[PDB]
Amino acid sequence: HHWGYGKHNGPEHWHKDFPIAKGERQSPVDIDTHTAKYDPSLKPLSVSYDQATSLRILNNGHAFNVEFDDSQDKAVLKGGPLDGTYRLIQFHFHWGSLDGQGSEHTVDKKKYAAELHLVHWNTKYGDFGKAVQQPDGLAVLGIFLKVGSAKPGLQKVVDVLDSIKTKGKSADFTNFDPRGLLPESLDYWTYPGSLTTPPLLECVTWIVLKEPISVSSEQVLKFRKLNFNGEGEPEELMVDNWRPAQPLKNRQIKASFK
Ligand SMILES: CCc1cc2c(cc1OS(N)(=O)=O)CC[C@@H]1[C@@H]2CC[C@]2(C)[C@@H](O)CC[C@@H]12
Ligand SMILES: [Zn+2]
Structure with missing residues (x-):
């Protein structure tokens, strides 16, 4: 009976195994755009993905991860x-x-159709497992998806999903360029928070882009054909794998823009 997103093991249950669920810097949050404060002094984001080397795509039972070297x-x-x-x-x-x-x-209580998380770790901690133990260990770039025009740079991801339908399946996934998933603007909101799934570690600096990317109805429909279950187990569609907004508590969300 491990954690998931169902009635009996979903977000309202996680605190039993992971009491930090009720902690002081949990994610996600509602971004109240009117209350976020512009922070001149915030520097422009630098996203340098020209030499990114993708390796593999993996269905891990709650999402699919595109992994990089x-x-x-x-x-x-x-x-x-x-x-x-x-x-x-x-x-x-x-x-x-x-x-x-x-x-x-x-964003002002608005829910988008999906959210992309680009996960990065602070190199001063030597590797990812040590980084998640640190309050400044990770930086996650969050990008909203709305349904409209297709995102051509997403299509290579969509087309391999048939090969990783169920939990534990992986496939080779080389030469994928994550620059094709970024919106035009890098204007962002930022706040200190956490992993959004168990173990909910409070190790993340969240950077959430203001501008969503558009994906087509057919693209997101293909996400919804994935399975939470392993092969040969009863089929449960991988949908609604999101944690709801958590209390902001003693945090201020900063904006990079006016
Ligand atoms: C930030 C991406 C991330 C990493 C991890 C999870 C979840 C992730 O999602 S999210 N939405 O970006 O927060 C949950 C499983 C975690 C993992 C970090 C590494 C571990 C903590 C392992 O040491 C033990 C369980 C693993
Ligand atoms: Zn995530």
């Missing part, structure tokens, strides 16, 4: 609120059963 500085995030250099290790998404829900963060 993070054994050298090849794809890094710097600047913004960040001190130092953070290396891209993977990206994944959260999405809904309907276009009207699926994002983890909300």
Whole structure:
């Protein structure tokens, strides 16, 4: 009876195994755009993905991860609120059963159809497992998806999903360029928070882009054909794999823009 997103093991249950669920810097949150404060002094984001080396795509039973070779500085995030250099290790998404829900963060209570998480770790901690133990260990770039025009740079991801339908399946996934998933603007909101799934560690500097990307109805429909279950187990569609907004508590969300 491990954690998931169902009635009996979903977000309202997680605190029993992971009491930090009720902690002081949990994610996601609602971004109240009127209350976020512009922070001049915030630096421009630097996203350097030209040498990114994707390796594999994996269905892990709650999402699918596109994993990268993070054994050298090849794809890094710097600047913004960040001190130092953070290396891209993977990206994944959260999405809904309907276009009207699926994002983890909300904007003035608005839910998007999905949310992309580009996960990076602070190189001063040597590797990802040590980084998640630190309050400034990770930087996650969050990008909202709305349904409209297709995102051509997403299509290679969509087309391999048939090969990783069930939990534990993986496939080769080389030469994928994550620059094709970024919106035009890098304007962002930032706040200190956590992993959004168990173990809910409070190790993340969240950087959430203001501008969503558009994906087509057919693209997000293909996400919804994935399974939470393993092969040969009863089929449960991988949909609504999002945690709802958590209390902001004693945090201020900062904006990079007026
Ligand atoms: C930031 C991406 C991330 C990493 C991890 C999870 C979840 C992720 O999603 S999210 N939405 O970006 O927060 C949950 C499983 C975690 C993992 C970090 C590494 C571990 C903590 C392992 O040491 C033990 C369980 C693993
Ligand atoms: Zn995530």
